[PDB]
Amino acid sequence: QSNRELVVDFLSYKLSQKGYSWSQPMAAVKQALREAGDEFELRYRRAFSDLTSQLHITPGTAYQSFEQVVNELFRDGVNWGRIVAFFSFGGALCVESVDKEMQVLVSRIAAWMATYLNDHLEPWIQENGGWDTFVELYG
């Protein structure tokens, strides 16, 4: 629970009430990631289902099993498309977990994805100009 998330939401709300739209650059990132993930799963369904078939999460799955599958996804280098697939992969694991009435695994998967991004992907993201570069390239 972030105090900064709470501050930014309250100020944004209070500004919109007076007619002012405080631009949050991460809002554009979130929207582009949603759309790119939708497009990846629909237009490249064979690539998407090939990734989701490699892991099914149970309460006994350790992070290292998720890390090994994702490491194989990035085996030939990081690019923004593989990063989209990584988000779609995690979302498919969460949908599956909820399907199987194991909703607690959603928060676990979300923590694994953040760990992987911060340990494996964040230097590359910084070198390539941060998430704003993703937005500019996707539209």
């Binding site: 064979r46 690539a47 690019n79 498309g81 989209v84 390239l137």
Partner: peptide, 13 residues
Amino acid sequence: TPEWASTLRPECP
């Protein structure tokens, strides 16, 4: 995108 799609393996926004 076309540039990301071209990094798929041939077997496979």
